[PDB]
User: What shape does this take?
Amino acid sequence: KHNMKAFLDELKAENIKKFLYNFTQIPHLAGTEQNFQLAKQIQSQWKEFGLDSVELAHYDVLLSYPNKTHPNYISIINEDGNEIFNTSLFEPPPPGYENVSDIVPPFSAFSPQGMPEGDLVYVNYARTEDFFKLERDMKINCSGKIVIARYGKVFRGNKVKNAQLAGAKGVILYSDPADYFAPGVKSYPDGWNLPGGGVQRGNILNLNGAGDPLTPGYPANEYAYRRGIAEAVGLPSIPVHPIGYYDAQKLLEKMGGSAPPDSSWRGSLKVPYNVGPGFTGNFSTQKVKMHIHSTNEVTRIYNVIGTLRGAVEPDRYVILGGHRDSWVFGGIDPQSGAAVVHEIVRSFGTLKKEGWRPRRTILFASWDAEEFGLLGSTEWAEENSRLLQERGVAYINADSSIEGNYTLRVDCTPLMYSLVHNLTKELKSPDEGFEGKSLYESWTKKSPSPEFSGMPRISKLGSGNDFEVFFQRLGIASGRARYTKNWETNKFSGYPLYHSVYETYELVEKFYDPMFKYHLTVAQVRGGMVFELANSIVLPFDCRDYAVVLRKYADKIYSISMKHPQEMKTYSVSFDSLFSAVKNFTEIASKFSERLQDFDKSNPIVLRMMNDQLMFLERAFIDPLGLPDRPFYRHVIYAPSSHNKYAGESFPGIYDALFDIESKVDPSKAWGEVKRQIYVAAFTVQAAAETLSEVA
Amino acid sequence: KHNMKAFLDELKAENIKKFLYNFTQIPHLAGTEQNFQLAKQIQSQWKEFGLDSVELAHYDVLLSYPNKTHPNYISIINEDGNEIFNTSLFEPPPPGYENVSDIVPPFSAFSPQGMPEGDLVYVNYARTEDFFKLERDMKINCSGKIVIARYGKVFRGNKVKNAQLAGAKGVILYSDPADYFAPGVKSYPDGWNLPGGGVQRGNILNLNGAGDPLTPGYPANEYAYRRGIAEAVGLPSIPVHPIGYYDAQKLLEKMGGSAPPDSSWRGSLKVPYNVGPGFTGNFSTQKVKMHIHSTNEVTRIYNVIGTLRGAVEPDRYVILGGHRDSWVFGGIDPQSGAAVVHEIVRSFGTLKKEGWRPRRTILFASWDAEEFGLLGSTEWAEENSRLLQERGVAYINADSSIEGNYTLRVDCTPLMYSLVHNLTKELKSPDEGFEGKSLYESWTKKSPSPEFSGMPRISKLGSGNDFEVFFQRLGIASGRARYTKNWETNKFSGYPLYHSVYETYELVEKFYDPMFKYHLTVAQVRGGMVFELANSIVLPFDCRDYAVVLRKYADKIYSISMKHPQEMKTYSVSFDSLFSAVKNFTEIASKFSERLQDFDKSNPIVLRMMNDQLMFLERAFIDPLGLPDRPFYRHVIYAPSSHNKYAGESFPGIYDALFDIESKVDPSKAWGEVKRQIYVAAFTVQAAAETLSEVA
Ligand SMILES: *[C@@H]1O[C@H](CO)[C@@H](O[C@@H]2O[C@H](CO)[C@@H](O[C@@H]3O[C@H](CO[C@H]4O[C@H](CO)[C@@H](O)[C@H](O)[C@@H]4O)[C@@H](O)[C@H](O[C@H]4O[C@H](CO)[C@@H](O)[C@H](O)[C@@H]4O)[C@@H]3O)[C@H](O)[C@H]2NC(C)=O)[C@H](O)[C@H]1NC(C)=O
Ligand SMILES: *[C@@H]1O[C@H](CO)[C@@H](O[C@@H]2O[C@H](CO)[C@@H](O[C@@H]3O[C@H](CO[C@H]4O[C@H](CO)[C@@H](O)[C@H](O)[C@@H]4O)[C@@H](O)[C@H](O[C@H]4O[C@H](CO)[C@@H](O)[C@H](O)[C@@H]4O)[C@@H]3O)[C@H](O)[C@H]2NC(C)=O)[C@H](O)[C@H]1NC(C)=O
Ligand SMILES: *[C@@H]1O[C@H](CO)[C@@H](O[C@@H]2O[C@H](CO)[C@@H](O[C@@H]3O[C@H](CO)[C@@H](O)[C@H](O[C@H]4O[C@H](CO)[C@@H](O)[C@H](O)[C@@H]4O)[C@@H]3O)[C@H](O)[C@H]2NC(C)=O)[C@H](O)[C@H]1NC(C)=O
Ligand SMILES: *[C@@H]1O[C@H](CO)[C@@H](O[C@@H]2O[C@H](CO)[C@@H](O[C@@H]3O[C@H](CO)[C@@H](O)[C@H](O[C@H]4O[C@H](CO)[C@@H](O)[C@H](O)[C@@H]4O)[C@@H]3O)[C@H](O)[C@H]2NC(C)=O)[C@H](O)[C@H]1NC(C)=O
Ligand SMILES: O=C(O)CC[C@H](NC(=O)N[C@@H](CCCC(=O)Nc1ccc(F)cc1)C(=O)O)C(=O)O
Ligand SMILES: O=C(O)CC[C@H](NC(=O)N[C@@H](CCCC(=O)Nc1ccc(F)cc1)C(=O)O)C(=O)O
Ligand SMILES: *[C@@H]1O[C@H](CO)[C@@H](O[C@@H]2O[C@H](CO)[C@@H](O)[C@H](O)[C@H]2NC(C)=O)[C@H](O)[C@H]1NC(C)=O
Ligand SMILES: *[C@@H]1O[C@H](CO)[C@@H](O[C@@H]2O[C@H](CO)[C@@H](O)[C@H](O)[C@H]2NC(C)=O)[C@H](O)[C@H]1NC(C)=O
Ligand SMILES: *[C@@H]1O[C@H](CO)[C@@H](O[C@@H]2O[C@H](CO)[C@@H](O)[C@H](O)[C@H]2NC(C)=O)[C@H](O)[C@H]1NC(C)=O
Ligand SMILES: *[C@@H]1O[C@H](CO)[C@@H](O[C@@H]2O[C@H](CO)[C@@H](O)[C@H](O)[C@H]2NC(C)=O)[C@H](O)[C@H]1NC(C)=O
Ligand SMILES: *[C@@H]1O[C@H](CO)[C@@H](O)[C@H](O)[C@H]1NC(C)=O
Ligand SMILES: *[C@@H]1O[C@H](CO)[C@@H](O)[C@H](O)[C@H]1NC(C)=O
Ligand SMILES: *[C@@H]1O[C@H](CO)[C@@H](O)[C@H](O)[C@H]1NC(C)=O
Ligand SMILES: *[C@@H]1O[C@H](CO)[C@@H](O)[C@H](O)[C@H]1NC(C)=O
Ligand SMILES: *[C@@H]1O[C@H](CO)[C@@H](O)[C@H](O)[C@H]1NC(C)=O
Ligand SMILES: *[C@@H]1O[C@H](CO)[C@@H](O)[C@H](O)[C@H]1NC(C)=O
Ligand SMILES: [Ca+2]
Ligand SMILES: [Ca+2]
Ligand SMILES: [Cl-]
Ligand SMILES: [Cl-]
Ligand SMILES: [Cl-]
Ligand SMILES: [Cl-]
Ligand SMILES: [Zn+2]
Ligand SMILES: [Zn+2]
Ligand SMILES: [Zn+2]
Ligand SMILES: [Zn+2]
Assistant: This one.
């Protein structure tokens, strides 16, 4: 038969291995010829594999690149203005790639140009609370200083925004061995750790979901009217540059001024981690000078869009999307994901050649320019927003398939919790010691739920990947899954070789997944979810799981507010409306669930009515007015944290109104806005419940 | 059989007459006990008539009322400060109603309080072009003056906004016999003309679609957080008051300063129509003093919502809505409409008692607080916006059924043109001289299309009624129909007794429609449209009619721009993208039409796919970012004119960018914004076309 088991059995580890090798021999930087050539290869092959149509969708968006003939670097300069120390111009290339052309040197994408000179201040991870410590407790003023910050904890764009608002005139980012060097394992090429010359690339924008900085709201097509650079969304106003720990040691070792305030400010280098400002006595007349000459350029990008038309509901879309563009070779990020997508397409295509079709339409996407701000997915969605919002069932992301080899990681909407539990119970664990056991058993054992005994951890969606426009802007049910590490040792960072030249095919084949078994398990999870979403007669969403988390989030936000009991009395701040809405959602969802299991389906109009009620339930959490000063974050339950784009925040409107409230000048106005956000949230929860009531 | 003919034949003129009489014996002002009692009567009767459920939906919104013990009035005062002339405190009540309690005296709803004193300037109709003439050509400065303006041409709220922006410190509105006294007909009670003591009530807000001034975006429910008065939407900043032509004569007769600039500034009173400022020589030390003491008050309002559940598609809504609140007796506005709705409900209910049900759900609405800013419809829609946007097929409005007795008037979306043509061909004309002929024949003869020989005039929707939230905010296909006058004699105004105490049952029965035949014809048009929309297997919308008007609108906006050929060359202003999008819409709509007529319907999924494509086509013209500084006007093809809320404007974004462009300080910036609006329009038209392409 043509069922889920036929789909799943056709997936092969050895195919995934061949595709990864094929996608990782040369760099595929967005906007380059190399990456256009790969786009055309993927298009031709998805056609060979059996899809009904495969098209390129192109856009002209703002990208950023270093100047080839005028390199970026940082100096220590003496009182005469002699440059006595210079940071490196390139990462030493890995064995056998030392002749590869067009490796982009490390840089911070979208940095403005400049040569600022000044005294250094060390700001730990440049988090909101690091700046609070420095400015409020230690009384150190960053205004007109160059700040040096270690990578980790939070998205680098948030670090830059925080430094800018503190008055810094430049930012230097570095990788500390405390965060990117796991104890007892060797540096690349002999193990999976970051060497002292390794550097993490990455953009430093604050887009808040806008997409292309020049065309917020509308696709960057051939006739688009653009903003001028001065009005572009999300660009930083001070120069930024990333370095490795060999270079960082030479900038940190002379630091004077105040001592670090406690041991959470000390990394693992042989230096005091003094905060500054400036260098100790003998070197106190030396300065740090940045030299940044990168340029922003409007450049063409290419998405590949494949269609497998549905047999019964061709106007209902289940999307499997992930990016293709890489910083250099992309051995983990993104090609470990893209190779998985390619094998999934191949398997659906083999079923299609034997006469099978899914019930609903499946769209497959190879996105461009993800590394420069989620640009290709967001422009495409801006173009197709009306089709997506009335027809979009679900979005499954497909970036890196591995970031470790310990256990599964899932982040998703509560609407897919029961789908994920059911599927993982039918899959085999790849783990050593669990042969013959289910993936559910191994995952639950290694990553237990903090709430419920005998269940696994499933996280909220944050951002920093291509699901953002689908989930937080448009309200399409979304999820993602990969293999991950045990979060001991380097607990505040991704894998050590992230966005470095050392992320290669050999990294993966030698040190992460030599049998390609973790890749195969991830293909079965991502693929299996898509199969169910596109083929189950009733959509596989359980509204009751949203009711349970809504109560948890309401308890959490109430507890935050209750740190201020005297203000809640004075300004009559009540959460009663929100708890009432959550109770109502719980009751209405339960009755909906009963009708769903019973009506059953001799009647296709009743079925589609309840499938439409299921599809539009995520959609009901969208406020067309957006969140304050963030118009493209429209989901009222979930937004990316204002302090860290990678992390999700629940009831973000209320959370941000409460944050640091004890420091606001006008408390009556601040508490007024807390109350306004309570009203908005309660109304939206009740309105979402009401979509599940009987329709007439 | 239970078909359209059974529905239509059950409607009776004599029932409509009895209901009008019943609804017009006492005043039904929003927020009063009288109007709550009528709401409860309508609820009980719609239940008796056979609807499945009938509920009240209440809101607490900002309303405005005069102070009972401190009356509003205007004076001429002398140099000593003696009040030598005072305007009247009330309209003389009509015969037999001189003992009715609670007739609200004439006032301008939402006026601030004040007693400003000053010199008068006469500003004709207070249109944008009247102020341009006064300030640019005649060099007269309205700053710190009281302005007096005649009613007509444009919505009164626009007059107030224009006066305020010119620096006026108060506004006096009056009814000129030139606009409200038809030659050769007598004053009420002996004919249908406005007497010298008659006054037009009405609100003076500039809401731009917001609804309740205190809760933009969200329903004004029990836990809503409100804006303070200072941040309320749309309130005027200077006092305003309306008067009749007896009083107006006494304010205008002493005017000096400059002469009227031409005869289009002269009405029909025996006065020079001098512009001022101030009075002639001997009276030049006299002034005009306003006394306004009205208060804004948060007050409860009640909508009645009736449901007739659909047999096949209960999750698809066809809405018939009109208001119940009146200024005084409401003999035309709104009860001539509400009596029509009541008989329509009764007729659908009789079919339902014999076992029939419509295919789709029909919702019936009796809206409150329409006269204070479309408040009841807009709050209800804000509450139910998620259900309306995914399930709303169409909205048919039902305010005043008559404004004359000459011929039919229809304003609607192009999607209902072919529906209206087909229906009116099957209805009998009520007109003298057309007995035995169709309503299509009489209407086409009396109101020919300016474009097409052998077809009737159908106008764009403007605003100033309860369809605004459904059409311009939410993108639900909308229409309205009534009997109207021949637009000779008083061509710039509604009927003479509009919003006066003299609009009574007797006005209608004696002078407009003694046989109730025009009412019956309007019930058949409104009712017939609802019947078809709720019962036709394929929705009765023709996408090809949108293609035809889109070309007309594109030609029109191009022609406006081409008044500035040198600027179009210098700034490279091209309409090519918009014409391309319109061509594409024409081609795609034509192919869609062919698939629609053929697929035919053994296949209900294919049917619903194309019914969904039809329903979501109006919805595709919505931009979730809104129009500039008007976030609740989201439709890109149609908005209410920025200069006149009653009139519709096509491609409003482009139109407003071009308006008065030759006066802007920075032409490169102004023409940049023209180009931005061209891009937005072209994109939206192409995106709307693409919803009609094959779905996969
Ligand atoms: C969770 O779900 C429940 C439904 O089970 C909702 O309950 C409603 O709650 C509101 C309060 O937010 C109640 O509002 C009150 O309505 C009264 C009138 O209700 C009757 O009549 C209406 C017609 O207008 C019917 O629809 C309804 O069924 C009732 O028969 C008003 O009289 C109340 O106002 C008076 O008291 C208040 C409170 O002190 C004063 O402020 C006022 O000034 C006034 O004196 C009030 O407006 C409503 O009746 C409830 N519906 C029910 C029980 O069916 C919850 O609201 C919902 N949670 C959320 C967040 O939506
Ligand atoms: C009305 O409907 C028609 C479709 O019938 C649309 O036509 C498209 O118009 C755009 C222009 O807006 C064309 O865009 C051009 O695409 C070229 C590549 O197209 C080929 O390859 C793509 C894959 O990316 C395929 O999808 C496509 O079928 C083609 O095979 C580009 O090379 C062009 O860019 C080059 O020339 C331009 C113009 O001088 C330069 O500015 C560039 O720098 C570059 O050198 C260009 O982008 C598109 O191909 C047309 N599609 C067709 C014919 O199918 C209209 O756009 C539509 N109207 C609106 C308003 O949407
Ligand atoms: C994840 O897996 C779980 C466990 O299998 C699954 O929950 C189960 O779903 C089934 C199917 O809905 C439930 O079965 C129903 O049981 C009730 C009462 O006991 C009956 O009323 C139902 O009978 C109707 O429907 C049947 C077909 O589905 C008809 O054969 C019958 O004639 C009736 O019309 C039905 O048998 C079962 O109770 C739950 N089990 C639970 C909750 O423990 C869950 O749905 C899966 N999640 C997904 C797919 O997202
Ligand atoms: C307003 O009234 C007009 C005039 O009646 C109406 O337009 C007409 O609609 C009918 C029904 O779609 C059209 O009839 C079709 O003609 C074409 C080609 O000549 C045929 O392909 C069609 O045959 C198919 O569908 C039939 C059932 O509808 C089946 O019996 C048949 O087996 C085929 O499947 C069909 O007969 C007619 O051509 C137009 N006339 C015009 C445009 O002049 C219009 O639709 C009405 N507007 C509304 C309802 O909004
Ligand atoms: O522009 C954007 O929104 C994101 C573009 C890009 N996106 C990613 O690289 N996303 C990776 C991030 C992987 C690295 C990681 O997870 N970092 C991390 C882990 C724990 C922390 F506490 C802090 C950082 C992913 O989603 O797989 C980037 O972050 O520069
Ligand atoms: O607040 C609002 O948006 C409108 C509230 C109310 N609405 C109406 O009274 N609407 C009537 C207006 C009827 C009078 C009219 O049509 N006036 C008109 C006609 C021609 C002109 F050139 C100018 C005005 C209707 O739609 O039937 C009002 O206008 O005060
Ligand atoms: C990755 O695999 C593809 C597909 O086999 C290779 O592209 C093909 O190259 C052959 C030999 O030159 C050509 O004849 C085909 O026309 C290509 N097919 C395409 C583009 O669809 C590609 O060379 C491989 N890349 C690497 C780095 O090994
Ligand atoms: C750091 O790099 C700079 C720039 O290349 C070096 O300074 C230059 O040295 C050359 C040759 O002595 C001079 O002609 C240039 O005028 C210098 N340029 C600037 C901007 O100072 C410097 O030697 C390097 N420092 C170290 C320690 O290698
Ligand atoms: C308008 O008609 C209604 C309905 O007949 C009248 O309301 C009824 O009044 C009678 C006699 O007092 C009561 O017994 C009924 O209970 C009422 N029914 C309702 C409210 O549904 C109403 O009196 C009439 N109004 C006027 C002004 O004639
Ligand atoms: C216009 O109305 C005003 C207010 O009622 C009249 O002026 C008042 O007259 C009484 C009795 O003479 C005085 O005691 C008050 O002090 C006056 N009030 C004000 C505010 O001036 C006035 O007589 C009326 N004018 C005409 C022509 O009837
Ligand atoms: C890159 O730098 C060189 C000079 O070192 C300069 O000639 C060129 O303009 C720069 N390229 C840009 C800005 O693209
Ligand atoms: C920080 O330093 C700048 C520049 O000298 C100054 O203008 C600013 O007010 C300072 N802030 C303090 C001391 O809080
Ligand atoms: C792969 O798994 C083994 C077994 O625990 C572990 O020791 C090794 O470090 C893992 N590789 C990576 C990259 O985590
Ligand atoms: C109405 O006017 C009287 C005085 O003439 C005053 O006592 C009362 O406060 C006013 N009512 C209001 C503001 O509602
Ligand atoms: C109109 O008069 C006011 C007040 O006297 C003045 O401030 C304003 O500038 C004047 N505008 C002109 C003369 O254009
Ligand atoms: C009703 O119709 C007649 C016939 O033309 C007309 O003369 C009369 O004035 C009409 N009534 C109104 C209110 O227009
Ligand atoms: Ca864009
Ligand atoms: Ca509101
Ligand atoms: Cl992912
Ligand atoms: Cl990281
Ligand atoms: Cl109307
Ligand atoms: Cl009028
Ligand atoms: Zn990635
Ligand atoms: Zn990345
Ligand atoms: Zn009305
Ligand atoms: Zn009215």
In short: Residues B 323, 333-334, 370, 399 surround zinc ion (ligand 25) (CB under 6 Å). Chain B touches chain A through 52 residues (CB under 8 Å). Chain B has three domains: 1-66+293-540, 67-292, 541-696.
